[PDB]
Every structure is written in structure tokens, then in C-alpha cells.
Amino acid sequence: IVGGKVCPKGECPWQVLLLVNGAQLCGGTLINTIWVVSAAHCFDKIKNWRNLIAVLGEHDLSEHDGDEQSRRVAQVIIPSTYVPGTTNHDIALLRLHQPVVLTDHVVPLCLPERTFSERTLAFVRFSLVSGWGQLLDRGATALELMVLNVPRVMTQDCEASYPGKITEYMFCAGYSDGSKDSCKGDSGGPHATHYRGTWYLTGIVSWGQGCATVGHFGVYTRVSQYIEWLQKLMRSEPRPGVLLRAPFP
Amino acid sequence: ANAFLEELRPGSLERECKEEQCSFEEAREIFKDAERTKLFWISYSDGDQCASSPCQNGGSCKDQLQSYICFCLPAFEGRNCETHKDDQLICVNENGGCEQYCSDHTGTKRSCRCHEGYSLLADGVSCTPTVEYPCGKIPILEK
Amino acid sequence: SGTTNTVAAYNLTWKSTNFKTILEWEPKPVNQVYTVQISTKSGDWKSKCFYTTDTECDLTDEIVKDVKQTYLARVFSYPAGNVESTGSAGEPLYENSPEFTPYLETNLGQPTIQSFEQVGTKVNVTVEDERTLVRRNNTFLSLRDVFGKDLIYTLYYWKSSSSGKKTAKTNTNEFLIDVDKGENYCFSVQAVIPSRTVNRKSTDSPVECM
């Protein structure tokens, strides 16, 4: 996160940290005790699947304070339309090996109805984006969880930033004046939107040209397009395998 | 206005343009100067665009030059106060007034609904948690 | 464009007098209807004028919530009779309005001379302090209420018997001027916000004469 501030401990309680072999990989969003939403591109280069861990209740990576809960990731589910190294359909649904315990520091973010998301949440100007990713483009990652309020734009108003590159499965948010954005290592983390006292998942940190560049916006996976896909998967009979491709739509 | 022999008299703004309707020429005879006459005439000849009673629903009309403005009662808006504030109770209008989810229905009023872990209150629009850690709340701050 | 299902609005224009503020646009509804949204520069978008055949939208009630904010509006097009058909991303075609800052840009309406009163060589001329669309609690605020010291009035006056024009200016709604006895004077006024760069002056009031 570029140009943000520390998210005080427990104020981003749906944030997930993903680790591979103990090393920081990406963020994620808790949506119930067993299921985490992240970005498909986080998994493009994994070989050591058995060492993929999700941490809930995390805040400061330098110390375990006891509110962290760590879980092996039993399954990573990606859209059948996702292609590694390409931007479209940048979403993954992760099944944890054991449920987390909900506490003051571990709470799921609501997965909204699609209509509500398109008609109402999409027109809340600002939403929070968070993560332990880079504090500046190509710079250092963060030891304390960072958070930033970013304003959304409709794709017509983002087109000139990324001509022909924003699909219906994406949306833009951020500051074309620069200096504030999500960044590398924040992928999979929530773009969370508040409405009338409750927070909802509207985007997933996905990609951008650099970070906080003038004339550009951050690009987020448009979660409203995936609500039914995610809901059906969470109800489905589990299939074997760590990495699963599931038909989209 | 002109009646027989009146025009033997000096012009009078009160007699000819206020108590009567005056033509441009009659006004010209009063003010003499072309520019002064025009400045009078642009307003005098404009007409009252409120005469057609354009403001609806108890609004009040204020005439302007070649136009009017409607002051509406508090429940109304529109150029003519034609719009009532609660006449499109639909989900795209401030979420139908619903706290969480909203559904439009054919032939029925819209309904409000709540997410899992919440239930709808008797007011028909608000939601309250039914579990200890419902989604989308920050318990460390609401304690 | 018989293969398109909507076309974007254009020529979006703010019509605003005494804070009564109406957005207007083109084109006339041709197989489509419109919805407007308005926001402040950093605020949420509110929808107005839902699925309308109008090519106008009254936004007065929104802009008077803070006349010193800068507002953005946009006009969305929807296929007629099929208004939920807005494409895969849920984003209908739209166009953006110019920014609008009511305090700086609303036109001052044509003023009215309320009265004049002469004693010998002096005359009071009083301008009506008329209502605007801005509400405070349950009441409409006057021009003076809204603009305070930023508003002045200018007086154009003349003796019928002389070719010259005279002027005076006031920080209130009242002028006290000297006149020659035995002469009939006529008067017109304009409202002025000197600090503005655009729409600084109203049109002239109707002419009133002794």
C-alpha cells in the first residue's frame, strides 16, 4: 500500500495473509470460517502447495501476539477462464484445512448480493484497500498491516488510463493525481465498501501500471461478477486436488 | 392605451402604462430617449410567465425575464414541483431505503432483506445481528 | 446507430437561477430513457430523475445542501422498456457534466425595486431582498442571507429632463441619494457579486419612476 496508514489492530479483521514456505506471498479476504477470497495470480508460480498457509488475525509480521490463527490451504479454486500471466478473471477461492475461530480480531467480510453490489455499493465513492505489500513501487513491503481509502471510477472514466485493457471483470479505483494506491504484494486483499453500518467485498487487489503513477488507477477484480460462482463453489461437494479449475460462469 | 383626445395630454407613465396597457410608442412618448425606453420596455413587455400557474403541488411561482422559478413545498421537487420525494420506492433509489438487500417486485411494494447472520426488524428496512460475529462488522470498535 | 441500444447524452448544461438548479441535456429520448446521478467532488453518488423521458433533471434539493461545494453530475442512458439491460458490467453508457459550484455560478435573478421614498432633496431606494431556493431549517433564505457581504446592488438613475445617467452602489438593499427638487427621476438596479469572475451581475430590474 502506497500513501496509506497502519490499520490499527482489529480494524481490518477480514484481512488474510498468505505465506508460502513461511514467506509472504499475497493477501486475501475472509468470507466465512473456512473460505478465503484471493487473486488467482498469487498462485501462478507455486510449486510447494503443501506449504501454503493463510494467517488470520495478523497485524505485525515481526511478532506473534497470540491473535494470529494459521491454517493450511486445502484447496485453491480458480476460474476455468483464468490464464496465468494475463489479467482477466483474477480471483481465487481458498478452502482452509480447518475453520478459524471468529474473535474480535478475525471476522468475515460480507459477500454482497450482485444486484446490491452493482446498484448501490458501486456508487459509494470511497472504499478501503489493505495489505502488507510494497510501500512504494519496487520498494519494501510493510511489517504492519496498511490501509488506504480509494475512490472508484466507472470504466468509461478509466478507459484512457488503460485503453482496451479494462474488462467487465475489472474496475478501477485510486488517484490519477498519484501518490496513493495499492501495490505489489497487496494482491488478493480486499477492496471493502461500507454501506449503512456494514462492510462488503467489492474488489480484489489485482494489477496496475506501477503503483501510484500519475494518470493511472489501481485495477481490481470486479467481485460482483463472481458472486454466484463463489456461492455455488462454497455449497459444492469438494473435489480432489489442491489446485482446482472450476467452470466460469 | 389611446382613447379619443387623450393624446392631446402630456404622457404619463401612471395613467398610460400602469392604469392602462401602453404600446411601445406610448412609452417612447414618455421617456423620449430610445435607450431609456428600451430599458423600461424589456421588463414591461416581458409578460408574467407565472400566469399559466406552472408550479404544482402547492408550490409558489416567481416570474423572471422570459422564465419563472418554482419554490416547492418540502415534499416536492422539479422545475414545476411535479416530483414527489417518495414516489419511486425502487431499489436503485437510495437502495429502496433498505439497510442491506432490496428486491423490486411486479405488482407489490419492494421488499428489504438481510444477509445471513442478520434478521429484518419490524420497521421492514433495518437489520440486526443474530450471531456474535456477523460479517462486515468491526467488533473491536463497537463494544 | 440502428445496431446500438443506447447513445450517450451530450451538451449537458447547468441552468441555475437563485439556486434553482436544473441539469439539461441532449438528445430527446430515442428508444431510451435517462437517469441522473449527482455527487460532491468527494461524496457518494445519488441517483435522481429515474428512467425518465425528460431531458432535464431538477437538482436544487441536492445542491442547496451545501452551496459552496462543487458538484459533478452524469446522465445515464437505458434501453427503453428494458432498463435493466445495461451490459455485462452493470455500467450503462453515460456522459459527465461540467463541474458546478452553486455559490459562484448560480445566476442572480432579475431584481425588483420594492419602494422609494423622497423627502426634499433626498430619496431612499429599497430593493426587495428576495427568496432563494436555499433552505435553512424550515425556511427559504434570502439572497442577503446566502451571500451576506458578498452581495451589492448598483443603481442606475436619471432625471427625465437631462440626458445624463447617474449611478450609486450599496452594500445593503438600500440607497440614499441626492436629487434635485421638482424633477422626476427614474431608477433601475442590478444585483452584483463583485468577487465573482463569471455571472457577476443580474439583469437590470424593471424601471420605476417618481
Ligand SMILES: *C[C@@](*)(O)[C@H](CCCNC(N)=[NH2+])NC(=O)[C@H](Cc1ccccc1)NC(=O)[C@@H](Cc1ccccc1)NC(C)=O
Ligand atoms: C499480485 C499482486 O500482488 C499485484 C498487485 C499490484 C497492484 N498494483 C496497483 N498499482 N494497484 N499484482 C501484480 O503485480 C500484477 C500481477 C500480474 C497480473 C496479470 C498479468 C501479469 C502479472 N502485475 C502488475 O501489476 C505489473 C504488471 C502489469 C503491468 C501492466 C498490466 C498488467 C500487469 N505491474 C507492474 C509491473 O507494474
Ligand SMILES: *[C@@H]1O[C@H](CO)[C@@H](O)[C@H](O[C@H]2OC[C@@H](O)[C@H](O[C@H]3OC[C@@H](O)[C@H](O)[C@H]3O)[C@H]2O)[C@H]1O
Ligand atoms: C405557463 O405554464 C406552462 C405549463 O402549463 C409552462 O410551460 C410555461 O412556461 C414555459 O413557457 C415559458 C418559459 O418562460 C418557460 O421556461 C422558462 O422558465 C422556466 C425555466 O425553468 C426555464 O429554464 C425557462 O426557459 C417554460 O417552462 C408557463 O409560462
Ligand SMILES: *[C@@H]1O[C@@H](C)[C@@H](O)[C@@H](O)[C@@H]1O
Ligand atoms: C409560496 O411558497 C410555497 C413554497 C408555499 O409555501 C406556498 O404556500 C406559497 O404561496
Ligand SMILES: C[N+](C)(C)C
Ligand atoms: C515469525 N516471527 C518469529 C518473526 C514472528
Ligand SMILES: C[N+](C)(C)C
Ligand atoms: C504460527 N502461529 C502464528 C500460528 C503461532
Ligand SMILES: C[N+](C)(C)C
Ligand atoms: C499450520 N499448521 C500446519 C500447523 C496447521
Ligand SMILES: C[N+](C)(C)C
Ligand atoms: C443509476 N444507475 C444505478 C443505474 C447507474
Ligand SMILES: C[N+](C)(C)C
Ligand atoms: C479518506 N478520505 C479523506 C480520502 C475520504
Ligand SMILES: C[N+](C)(C)C
Ligand atoms: C495533470 N496531470 C494529471 C497530467 C498531472
Ligand SMILES: C[N+](C)(C)C
Ligand atoms: C420583476 N420581476 C419580473 C422579477 C418580478
Ligand SMILES: C[N+](C)(C)C
Ligand atoms: C419598502 N420599505 C420602505 C418597507 C423598506
Ligand SMILES: C[N+](C)(C)C
Ligand atoms: C458566505 N457568507 C458567509 C459570506 C455568507
Ligand SMILES: C[N+](C)(C)C
Ligand atoms: C440606509 N442607507 C441607505 C444610508 C444605508
Ligand SMILES: [Ca+2]
Ligand atoms: Ca503478528
Ligand SMILES: [Ca+2]
Ligand atoms: Ca390612455
Ligand SMILES: [Ca+2]
Ligand atoms: Ca396614450
